């Protein structure tokens, strides 16, 4: 909506979408022993 909210991930795409798709596959495989999930912000939009 606003280019500064999409940059700071107030709105826009979730972490499955704006991150590099290899980092999503890395965090999906190493999740049980090295969690990268809380390092990235998911926008929830009403």
């Amino acid at each position: 909506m606003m280019p500064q909210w999409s940059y700071m991930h107030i709105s826009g795409q979730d972490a499955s979408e704006y991150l590099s798709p290899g980092l999503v596959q890395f965090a999906r495989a190493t999740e049980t022993y090295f969690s990268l999930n809380n390092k990235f912000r998911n926008p929830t939009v009403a």
Binding site: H9, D14, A15, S16, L19, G22, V24, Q25, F26, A27, R28, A29, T30, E31, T32, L36, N37, N38, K39, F40, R41, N42, P43, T44
Partner: peptide
């Protein structure tokens, strides 16, 4: 990245795709 995942059987035990980021705030 199946060489980083533990093997339950012979399939890589991967997480979900959309479980990458956090979204929790003080009531939102």
């Amino acid at each position: 990245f199946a060489s980083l995942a533990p093997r339950h059987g012979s399939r890589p035990f991967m997480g979900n795709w959309q479980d990458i980021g956090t979204s929790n705030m003080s009531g939102g």
